[PDB]
Design a protein around this ligand. Structure first.
Ligand code: C90
Ligand code: ZN
Length: 287
């Protein structure tokens, strides 16, 4: 009902998944109507980039926010955690151009946010409510918003790989009955060994390891300790979608369905929705 921020400042450290750079992350409370703002504190002047669809850059690997010649790479997992915990306002300070990958999931971030504490603010919380279907497609990929009285995220993947043979590749999460933390937050990012070796040849995925990603070779999951969920891969796609959806700037009242979608198509959906003014409205929980 009311806007939420952090109660205290909290710090964490990690490595950027693509850049491999050590990064210091500081989450800070922020005033009412700030939204989630990334701050590049290594730069003078400090560059603030609100986590909004208009600040997304063209990047095929992850969601990247850009302002001038400055970027903040790989924001989706931390944004998913902000969205999952209903954090309206926060500054996310970074000492480098990439959010740390942590364990590849939103687990460390949801724990970090809860550890900082939650602070109720003196302003009504606003939600973006989907009023009509908005859909984007490209080839076999689709991402759609549908009106829904609540918040629901559906995803389907379809990989031609034996690890995916008979494995859950579709999942739907209705957040009125399911906990973001319990069933989505711990889902780790994943990569196919071929895709990974190719990113490595482009000097990308430098901070990647079996400690922060599920690595799938031609036969099996390489990670010795296995999966956190039988449907971990599709649950991570849901985690990614929730982070991308949070670039709308407010919690969503609606349903998202993704069909082999990724950050590029998710962002195209956000832009089409915003441009389609009659397809959405910004409302309070009471309204
Ligand atoms: C939708 C998601 O697929 C998407 N994830 C990514 O695109 C993504 C994930 C992980 C990585 C990585 C990595 C990495 C892991 C291990 C090794 C070491 N070895 C290399 C050879 O095999 C044995 C191990 C090197 C690098 C790269 C990219 C996402 O979550 N977007 O949000
Ligand atoms: Zn991801």
């Amino acid at each position: 009902i009311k806007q939420r921020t952090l109660k205290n400042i909290i710090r964490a450290t990690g490595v950027g998944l693509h850049s491999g750079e050590k990064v210091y992350l500081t989450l800070k409370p922020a005033p009412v109507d700030t939204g989630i703002v990334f701050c590049r504190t290594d730069l003078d002047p400090v560059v603030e980039i609100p986590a909004r669809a208009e600040n997304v850059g063209e990047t095929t690997m992850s969601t990247t926010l850009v302002k001038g010649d400055v970027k903040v790479d790989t924001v989706e997992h931390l944004l998913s955690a902000m969205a999952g915990l209903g954090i309206d306002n926060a500054y996310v300070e970074l000492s480098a151009s990439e959010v740390p990958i942590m364990d590849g999931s939103a687990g460390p971030f949801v724990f970090l946010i809860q550890s900082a504490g939650l602070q109720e603010q003196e302003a009504a919380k606003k939600f973006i409510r989907i009023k009509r279907e908005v859909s984007v497609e490209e080839g076999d990929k689709r991402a759609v918003f549908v009106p829904f009285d609540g918040f629901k995220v559906s995803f389907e993947i379809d990989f031609d790989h034996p690890v995916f043979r008979g494995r859950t590749q579709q999942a739907s999460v209705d957040f009125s009955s399911t906990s973001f933390v319990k069933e989505v937050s711990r889902a780790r990012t994943f990569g196919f060994m071929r895709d990974i070796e190719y990113l490595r040849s482009q000097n990308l995925a430098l901070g990647g390891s079996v400690e922060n990603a599920i690595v799938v070779d031609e036969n099996r999951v390489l990670n010795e300790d296995g999966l956190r969920y039988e449907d971990e891969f599709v649950k991570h796609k849901i985690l990614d979608a929730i982070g991308d959806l949070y670039l709308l700037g407010n919690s969503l009242i609606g349903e998202f369905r993704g069909f082999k979608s990724g950050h590029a198509l998710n962002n195209q959906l956000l832009r089409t929705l915003i441009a389609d003014k009659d397809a959405w409205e910004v409302v309070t929980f009471e309204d």
